């Protein structure tokens, strides 16, 4: 996260770290959506251009964390993966369209002050809140600058950007399964996700029911925190029918 701040304890209790077993390293963010299900970006698990194709046994998820590098004894919980599910129309060849994946845990994680699921949006919450100017919140342990790494989880609040501005900022083809967020050059505030934050959540706090909803997944950006560029996020509501199908079937 670029130009963010240290999270408060328990501020993002749905935060998940995707952790490579060997070498032991941070791979991506993710989020807890139930006691057995974790949501992330497909490209965190499958990206053939970089020879990335993880299997369940390659990975662990670490839940309830605050410190990036410490083993947070009596606080974090470490879970093994039963099965990975990648959206069948995830477009890794072109533009990361439908950049979404689910991971089912081998056993349920116990909730605590530090471990608690985020809500997924309904159509009405999405329609009300996914509007240009409305701010969401991005969290992660990724790099602090494009070109360095944080002691603890970082947080930044960023405004959703008008779709024509998103499209006009890039040569990549933007789809309805993406939205973008970040400040414009003229706005005099900054911030973005960066490498290591992808797969983590973009959340909004509904003013109707005071609950946090995951509206986006950190998906891609051209660099980090560049003037005139924006971060792109998977549109969670648009893909919720797939989410529901996977959880209902499996």
């Amino acid at each position: 996260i670029v130009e963010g701040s240290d999270a408060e304890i328990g501020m993002s209790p749905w935060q998940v770290m995707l952790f490579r077993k060997s070498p032991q390293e941070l791979l991506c963010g993710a989020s807890l959506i139930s006691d057995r299900w974790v949501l992330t970006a497909a490209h965190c698990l499958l990206y053939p251009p970089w020879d990335k194709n993880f299997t369940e046994n390659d990975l662990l998820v670490r839940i309830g964390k605050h410190s990036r590098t410490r083993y947070e004894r009596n606080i974090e919980k470490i879970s093994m993966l039963e099965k990975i599910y990648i959206h069948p129309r995830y477009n890794w060849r072109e533009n990361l369209d439908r950049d979404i994946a689910l991971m089912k845990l081998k056993k349920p994680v116990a909730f605590s002050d530090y471990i608690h699921p985020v809500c997924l949006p309904d159509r009405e919450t999405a329609a009300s809140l996914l509007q240009a100017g409305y701010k969401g919140r991005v969290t992660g342990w990724g790099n602090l600058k494009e070109t360095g790494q944080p002691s603890v989880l970082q947080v930044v609040n960023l405004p959703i950007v008008e779709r024509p501005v998103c499209k006009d900022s890039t040569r990549i083809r933007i789809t309805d399964n993406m939205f973008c967020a970040g400040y414009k050059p003229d706005e005099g505030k900054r911030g973005d996700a960066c490498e290591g934050d992808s797969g983590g959540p973009f959340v909004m706090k509904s003013p109707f029911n005071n609950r946090w909803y995951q509206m986006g997944i950190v998906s891609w950006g051209e660099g980090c925190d560049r003037d005139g560029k924006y971060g792109f996020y998977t549109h969670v509501f648009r893909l919720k029918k797939w989410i529901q199908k996977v959880i209902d079937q499996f």
Partner: peptide, 11 residues
Amino acid sequence: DFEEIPEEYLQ
């Protein structure tokens, strides 16, 4: 530099 995690999670 990540602190080693308990071996139980790697078995």
